[PDB]
Paper text:
Superimposition onto the A/Anhui/1/05 HA trimer showed that [name] is bound to the RBS at the membrane-distal end of the HA spike. The binding buried 761 Å2 surface on HA1, and 514 and 312 Å2 surface on the heavy and light chain of [name], respectively. The CDR-H3 of [name] was also 22-residue long and inserted into the receptor-binding pocket, interacting with the 130 loop, 150 loop, 190 helix and 220 loop of HA1. The CDR-L1 and CDR-L2 loops further interacted with the 130 and 150 loops, thereby stabilizing the insertion of CDR-H3 into the pocket. The epitope of [name] consisted of 17 external residues in the RBS including E130, S133, K156 and N159 identified through the random mutagenesis study. This result was in complete agreement with our previous finding that [name] neutralized the virus by directly blocking the attachment of the virus to the host cell. Furthermore, the 18 residues within the epitope had about 84.8% conservation, significantly less than that of 65C6 (91.9%) and providing explanation for its limited breadth in neutralization. As epitope of [name] completely overlapped with RBS, the neutralization mechanism of [name] would be expected to directly block virus binding. [name] had reasonably good potency with an average IC50 of 0.620±1.477 μg ml−1 but was only able to neutralize 11 out the 17 pseudoviruses.
HA is a homotrimeric integral membrane glycoprotein and forms spikes at the surface of the virion. The HA1 subunit is primarily responsible for binding the virus to cellular receptor sialic acid, while the HA2 subunit mediates subsequent fusion between the viral envelope and the host cellular endosomal membrane. Structurally, the HA1 subunit demonstrates a globular while the HA2 subunit adopts a hairpin form composed of two antiparallel alpha-helixes. On the basis of five human neutralizing mAbs isolated earlier by us from the two recovered individuals, we first solve the crystal structure of three representative mAbs bound to the globular head of HA with distinct epitope specificities, neutralization potencies and breadth.
Numbering used by the authors:
A (entry chain A): 53 to 68, 81 to 259
B (entry chain H): 1 to 52, 58 to 141, 151 to 201, 207 to 227
C (entry chain L): 2 to 106, 110 to 213
Write the structure that this text describes.
């Protein structure tokens, strides 16, 4: 409506194709493989949105935490509605074990994200762990992520970066996330029917 | 160290004016939001105001003004219209956020706290009187001053041994009085006393 | 600036105490975090907890925040005499900032008692005051008597009491009896009588002009 593409999916509190949009990604960082998705992103004659993992699934981590000046909603810091930025709990970030089997006979649109920081003392602030990662897999694809850390500019007022990724989780299949830190999990997902 | 420093506070009359700067070193001022938090006598803390863009609590609105200079790396709080109830020690404070390079107060916390500078709204001034409490424990007493605070050191000030500097007693005279005492089992020793805003410095050697 | 907090707790060494900070569904029924502050008695606040469960450095592992619905809780395990302070919780509501109202905090000691006559200088000045000292006792509830030739003198004193000492964890109290020098020198005996928990047969220390 007022938004771009991606952020509108991620949910981007600033919006509820578009040529060159005001709001794409409210927090900085890359977007991995925008182009590819765009193509078969259209050719969809049917659409609705539903949840998969609520924030209430995690007792071992601090759920509603990340919201920033870079992503406010009416002057109040917020975050991409559907993505969820996870912070350490009780000075502790237990490695995440979570999996979602798609029981729906209809396919599923899946995305998640990785937060890049600058100082590792600052890494120690949020995630408590000096060296973290993300590793996900579905059937064909197996992903492994690590945050790149030195220092940076101020883009969107922010010194940090956030890369997000995408996949398509086949029906009666699963997807396996693994991270001890620097990870941004999903909350709500998209049921998709192709053309 | 990381130093938050608030200077220039003292006695102001009701309907007065006070400008308090917070003086900063150790980080990049522009990279953080800052706040003022005040504590009244025998009370807790109350948010005053913050700046990255200026925010203010309700009790101060329109009569307080928060201002920051990163060129000089300080920040002010202009207090006019000051009444009575405004008397509190003023902590200059650091706003620290999960979300990092944010200039944002919305939800962040206070990691670094200032030393505090007491603003007093009343009339009129004073300075104390130092008489010894003398042995056969011991120490000296401070009588009849205004405003607060005073500060008690011992033997040029380097003594932390069984020392007790009491809570000040606002007297019927409307003048704070108090006592600073030390301790010792068996057998020259001076308490070093400054009440700053009478421009008073006094130190009296104690013995019987 | 007020959320809600209990006035004061009490605890024993090594034991566990739980600090509640309550609130409406407006603020903690919102999801904004709760932060805590440990402020030593006559010092700035120090950031204690942040983000409800997390501590900065220089802070012990014996401190744990737990946030539940419209309430939140500060707990401490393996207690120490270094942990004595005022504990406030902070949170936001519709911006601004809101705070708790704070919460304050074991062997019985008998208070070392003393009595101090008046100075000389204080005399030629004007009126004259008399101070009685009680050092380092537990517990907090107590009483002091000014007996002038057995006459219990009421009206003439104010008394201040020191916040619980850090490492011994023991209070001390100065009682200052303020008089008029003329109305001062008539009689001779001026006493201080102190009844503690550890007492036995009570204690009275005095002097003559």
């Amino acid at each position: 409506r007022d938004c771009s593409v991606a952020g509108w999916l991620l949910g981007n509190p600033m919006c509820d194709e578009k040529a060159n949009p005001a709001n794409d990604l409210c927090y900085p960082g890359n977007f991995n493989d925008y182009e590819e998705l765009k193509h078969l992103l259209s050719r969809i004659n049917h659409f609705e949105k539903i949840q998969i993992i609520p924030k209430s699934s995690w007792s071992d981590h601090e759920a509603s935490s990340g919201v920033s000046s870079a992503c406010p909603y009416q002057g109040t810091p917020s975050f991409f509605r559907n993505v969820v930025w996870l912070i350490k709990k009780n000075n502790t970030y237990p490695t995440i074990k979570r999996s979602y089997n798609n029981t729906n006979q209809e396919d599923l649109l899946i995305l998640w994200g990785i937060h890049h920081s600058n100082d590792a003392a600052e890494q120690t602030k949020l995630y408590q762990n000096p060296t973290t990662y993300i590793s996900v897999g579905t059937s064909t694809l197996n992903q492994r992520l690590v945050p790149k850390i030195a220092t940076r500019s101020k883009v969107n007022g922010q010194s940090g970066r956030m890369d997000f990724f995408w996949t398509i989780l086949k029906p009666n299949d699963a997807i396996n996330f693994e991270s001890n830190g620097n990870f941004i999990a999903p909350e709500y997902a998209y049921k998709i029917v192709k053309k | 160290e990381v130093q938050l420093l608030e200077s220039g506070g003292g006695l102001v009359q009701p309907g007065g004016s006070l400008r308090v700067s917070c003086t900063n070193s150790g980080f990049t001022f522009s990279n953080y939001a800052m706040s003022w938090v005040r504590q009244a006598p025998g009370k807790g803390l109350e948010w005053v105001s913050a700046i990255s863009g200026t925010y203010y609590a309700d009790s101060v609105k329109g009569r307080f003004t928060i201002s920051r200079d990163n060129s000089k790396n300080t920040m002010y709080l202009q207090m006019n219209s000051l009444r009575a109830e405004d008397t509190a020690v003023y902590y200059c404070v650091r706003d620290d956020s999960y979300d990092g390079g944010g200039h944002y107060g919305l939800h962040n916390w206070f990691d670094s706290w200032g030393q505090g500078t007491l603003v007093t709204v009343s009339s009129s001034t004073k300075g104390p009187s130092v008489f010894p409490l003398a042995p056969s424990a011991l120490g000296c007493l401070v009588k009849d001053y205004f405003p607060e605070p005073v500060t008690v050191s011992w033997n040029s000030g380097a003594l932390t041994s069984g020392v007790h500097t009491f809570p000040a007693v606002l007297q019927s005279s409307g003048l704070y009085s108090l006592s600073s005492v030390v301790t010792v089992p068996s057998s020259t020793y001076i308490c070093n006393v400054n009440h700053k805003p009478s421009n008073t410095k006094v130190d009296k050697k104690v013995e019987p | 600036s007020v959320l809600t907090q209990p006035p004061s707790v009490s605890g024993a060494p090594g034991q566990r105490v739980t600090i509640s900070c309550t609130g409406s569904s407006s603020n903690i029924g919102a999801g904004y975090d709760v932060h805590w502050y440990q402020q030593l008695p006559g010092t700035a606040p120090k950031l204690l907890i942040y983000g409800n469960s997390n501590r900065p450095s220089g802070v012990p592992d014996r401190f744990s925040g737990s946030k539940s619905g419209t309430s939140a809780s500060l707990a401490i395990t393996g207690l120490q005499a270094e942990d004595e302070a005022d504990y406030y919780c902070q949170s936001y509501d519709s911006s601004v900032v809101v705070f708790g109202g704070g919460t304050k905090l074991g062997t019985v000691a008998a208070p070392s008692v003393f009595i101090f006559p008046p100075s000389d200088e204080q005399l030629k000045s004007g009126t004259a005051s008399v101070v009685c000292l009680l050092n380092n006792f537990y517990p907090r509830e107590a009483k002091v008597q000014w007996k002038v030739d057995n006459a219990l003198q009421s009206g003439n004193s104010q008394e201040s009491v020191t916040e619980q000492d850090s490492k011994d964890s023991t209070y001390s109290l100065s009682s200052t009896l303020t008089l008029s020098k003329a109305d001062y020198e008539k009689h001779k005996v001026y006493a201080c009588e102190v009844t503690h928990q550890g007492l036995s047969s009570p204690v009275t220390k005095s002097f003559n002009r």
